[PDB]
Amino acid sequence: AICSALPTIPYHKLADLRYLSRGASGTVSSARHADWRVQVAVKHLTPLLDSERKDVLREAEILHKARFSYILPILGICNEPEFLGIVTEYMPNGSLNELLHRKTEYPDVAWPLRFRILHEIALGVNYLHNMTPPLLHHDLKTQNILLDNEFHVKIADFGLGTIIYMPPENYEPGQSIKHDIYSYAVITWEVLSRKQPFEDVTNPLQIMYSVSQGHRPVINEESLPYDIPHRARMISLIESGWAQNPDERPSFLKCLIELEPVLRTFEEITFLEAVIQLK
Amino acid sequence: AICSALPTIPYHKLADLRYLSRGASGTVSSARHADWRVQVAVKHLLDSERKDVLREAEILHKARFSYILPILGICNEPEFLGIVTEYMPNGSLNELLHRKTEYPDVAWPLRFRILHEIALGVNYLHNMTPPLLHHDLKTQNILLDNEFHVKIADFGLSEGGTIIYMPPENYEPGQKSRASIKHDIYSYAVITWEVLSRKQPFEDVTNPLQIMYSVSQGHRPVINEESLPYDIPHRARMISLIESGWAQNPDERPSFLKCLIELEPVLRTFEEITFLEAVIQLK
Ligand SMILES: COc1cccc(-c2nn(C(C)(C)C)c(N)c2C(N)=O)c1
Ligand SMILES: COc1cccc(-c2nn(C(C)(C)C)c(N)c2C(N)=O)c1
Ligand SMILES: [Ca+2]
């Protein structure tokens, strides 16, 4: 059994520590490693708690064990009595959430890139589900689908807010293999429409109520134009993905087998052209 | 310390297996993983040739970093042994520099990012505990990913091939030669020269042994207008980097950390957009 240890990073090695965002998991800051000469990202919560330490160490172990092409690569851990945090590669293009909803900044997000993003999300989650034992994300949202330098996906913040990606059966306490695909069906809808799921709804409870009654984000000509490539296929994927009955939702394998023919239609140059258009 | 175990990949999980090349350290094939649904590269071959595969696996697994080839798993069966890594669609730096018909242009910003990335990768190895030394840096084992970012592979020396990247004092190897923390920077310097000129080092000299004599004396690849034009961005500071890196005396050669610090302002002069334009031009 070949083993690899996660490097320990001394806090004094991280320079230019600039704030980026504060979330439930912690505060994300950009920095540069003094020795390695690369930009990094740091996640930290001053005294915290005795149990709060057990969380940060658990996320680091998860990222380190779930290493893959579509999972945020972890570079090291800051484990000092003075400062606690995880260090990962720096994602310069933010979250899928920002790309989809910052419409003045991004008026055109070409179809091939949207499909590649959807393909990559499914590849990362599929990889998790294929580990031994299977790792379940359970918190998939557009906010934690990160975008690297070339707009390739890196999945973060996982296994271990917003309930729009939570399946109806999760509302009541439960004693859960079909969660992730529900979240993925919503993300797919969001990616293809660039609309916020349930725009007309003020209170999150009204969403939760509607979802328990089998209602989903709206599928019509307004939300999903008829000119969307592979529209029919994508609609089937979405509708099966978010089906009320968990048993009627596909595995990520089935989902990938469905996506593969779609992705083969796009030339490699079209992904590059979609990216250059965003700059 | 937290431990990550390298996955064992059953050989039968690999489908659509196609031959890519035959190298000194083994045969390289492309494939798709049946469960993970990604393209992969597979490197394969008694009880002695077995430990070499396992060693490169362990090194790739321990040396994980943004500019090092990511290993995905290992095939360890009585029927088949080999390593599985991320598939590099754009081959080696060597093929980029010397396939002039296939690649008429290789824009300056891309060349500089390639150089910056090789340096970041090697630097990382040098900064591990204990320091990992490459000792076989050549253009043939600098791999290029889908968007022409660098992945360093082949830690087999961490029959042979090319001698042009080997420093003179390493010609007759010893205890001092194998522990030399200044081997790699010499290789990097020759690589830097080769990148900036798109010329085969010592082209005039067609006899490999003669190159070895010339290099002993103090001769290096030709630094003139013919090989390195005046139009080359930051020409002077690069020649300074090359010449100091391939200096006859190992004590006069800089660390990668110093080369990086020199390179940082050079890379900042290129707008982000140009890197993307360069890749589109090659595609
Ligand atoms: C350092 O660890 C993490 C963990 C999860 C997400 C991020 C991260 N968030 N963002 C925001 C988009 C939320 C600012 C980035 N740009 C991150 C990164 N790795 O670069 C960092
Ligand atoms: C499977 O392990 C390796 C190890 C070292 C190099 C390569 C590799 N060589 N090439 C050649 C350029 C030599 C064909 C590729 N395209 C590789 C890859 N990782 O895709 C593979
Ligand atoms: Ca061309």
From Swiss-Prot, chain B:
Mutagenesis or variant effect for K43M: Abolishes protein-kinase activity. Reduces FAS-mediated apoptosis
Cross-link annotation Glycyl lysine isopeptide (Lys-Gly) (interchain with G-Cter in ubiquitin), location: K182
Major location category of this protein: cytoplasm
Reactions catalysed according to its record: L-seryl-[protein] + ATP = O-phospho-L-seryl-[protein] + ADP + H(+); L-threonyl-[protein] + ATP = O-phospho-L-threonyl-[protein] + ADP + H(+); L-tyrosyl-[protein] + ATP = O-phospho-L-tyrosyl-[protein] + ADP + H(+)
Start and end residues of each stretch annotated as Helix alphaC: 55-63
Residues that coordinate or bind ATP: L20, S21, R22, G23, A24, S25, G26, T27, V28, K43
Modified residues (Phosphoserine): S158
Compartment(s): Cytoplasm; Cell membrane; Endoplasmic reticulum
Gene Ontology CC entries for this record: cytoplasm; cytoskeleton; cytosol; endoplasmic reticulum; plasma membrane; protein-containing complex; vesicle
A GO MF term: protein homodimerization activity
Domain Protein kinase: 14-267
Regulation: In the inactive state, the helix alphaC is packed against the helical, non-phosphorylated activation segment (AS). Upon activation, helix alphaC is displaced and the phosphorylated AS becomes disordered. Specifically inhibited by GSK583, which blocks NOD2 signaling by interfering with XIAP binding to RIPK2. Specifically inhibited by CSLP37 and CSLP43, which blocks NOD2 signaling by interfering with XIAP binding to RIPK2.
UniProt note on tissues of expression: Detected in heart, brain, placenta, lung, peripheral blood leukocytes, spleen, kidney, testis, prostate, pancreas and lymph node.
Membrane topology: Peripheral membrane protein
Modification comment: Polyubiquitinated via both 'Lys-63'- and 'Met-1'-linked polyubiquitin following recruitment by NOD1 or NOD2, creating docking sites for downstream effectors, triggering activation of the NF-kappa-B and MAP kinases signaling. 'Lys-63'-linked polyubiquitination by XIAP is essential for NOD2 signaling and promotes recruitment of the LUBAC complex. Also polyubiquitinated with 'Lys-63'-linked chains by PELI3, BIRC2/c-IAP1 and BIRC3/c-IAP2. Ubiquitinated on Lys-182 via 'Lys-63'-linked by ITCH.
Function noted in UniProt: Serine/threonine/tyrosine-protein kinase that plays an essential role in modulation of innate and adaptive immune responses. Acts as a key effector of NOD1 and NOD2 signaling pathways: upon activation by bacterial peptidoglycans, NOD1 and NOD2 oligomerize and recruit RIPK2 via CARD-CARD domains, leading to the formation of RIPK2 filaments.
UniProt record similarity statement: Belongs to the protein kinase superfamily. TKL Ser/Thr protein kinase family.
Domain notes: Contains an N-terminal kinase domain and a C-terminal caspase activation and recruitment domain (CARD) that mediates the recruitment of CARD-containing proteins.
Protein known as: Receptor-interacting serine/threonine-protein kinase 2
Organism: Homo sapiens (Human)
Gene name per UniProt: RIPK2
